């Protein structure tokens, strides 16, 4: 029974590992993309504020 357990769990752990490398890659990429998107939005807001201040002045 435990022979079986080990074989199957080893299967799922190599599964976990193969899925977890992809999950770490995807999560790092998602966090990086979110940070870059927020940076771009901050730069765009800075440009919009510059346009507003130049227009008002």
């Amino acid at each position: 029974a435990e022979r079986e357990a080990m074989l199957a769990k080893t299967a799922a752990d190599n599964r976990k590992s193969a899925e977890q490398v992809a999950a770490a890659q995807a999560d790092y990429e998602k966090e990086m993309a979110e940070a870059r998107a927020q940076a771009s939005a901050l730069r765009d807001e800075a440009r919009a504020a510059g346009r507003s201040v130049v227009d008002e002045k």
Binding site: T10, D13, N14
Partner: protein, 50 residues
């Protein structure tokens, strides 16, 4: 006396036959299964490490 000896020679022949032609397949069969199980334990260990 004579019967014992003759059946003892017969047992010697049987032992030789099994050791030469029956022992190699079975012992090594068990042996191959053994190798397999140990290497499976090994794969499990590796996966745990992974």
């Amino acid at each position: 006396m004579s019967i014992f000896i003759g059946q003892l020679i017969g047992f010697a022949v049987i032992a030789f036959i099994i050791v030469k032609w029956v022992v190699p397949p079975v012992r090594t069969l068990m042996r191959n299964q053994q190798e397999a199980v140990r290497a499976a334990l090994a794969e499990s260990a590796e996966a745990a490490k992974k």
